[PDB]
DNA sequence: CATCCGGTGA
DNA sequence: TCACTGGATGT
């Protein structure tokens, strides 16, 4: 049972077409709008700006 | 020197990145295009597909 | 399977 | 950061 970070938007998404149909993905959305679809792309996004609060680890993408 | 069944492909694959880095892996191609990283979804295809003439042990994913 | 991101095209 | 999916990759 995981909390989502001050600003940020966590979505759950079900695939409607394609040989993946009814699969779920998870993506998070920044308090700028920016859209990460995985924990290493958001990651790579902390270490960019030198984020020392939030961790990966804040960041649910199980579903 | 175990031979590969006529319109297939024997791929040798080294991994890259991550905890086992430098490790290979083998999968075939058949003739249709259809990857196997397995042996047991290669014999599996064999199956469903009632083919009677080739067999597991015809592919050698070993390296 | 969990996790990822490049390909694709509206 | 285009939204959404295919199928590669390592666990
Ligand atoms: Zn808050
Ligand atoms: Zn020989
Ligand atoms: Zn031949």
Same sequence: chains 1, 2.
Avoid: M
């Avoid at 409607?16 to 308090?31: E, M, Q, W």
């Amino acid at each position: 049972h995981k909390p989502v970070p001050c600003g940020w938007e966590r979505v759950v998404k079900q695939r409607l077409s394609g040989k993946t149909a009814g699969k779920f993905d998870v993506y998070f959305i920044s308090p700028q709008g920016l859209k990460f679809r995985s924990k290493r792309s958001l990651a790579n996004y902390l270490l960019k700006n030198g984020e020392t609060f939030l961790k990966p680890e804040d960041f649910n993408f199980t579903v």
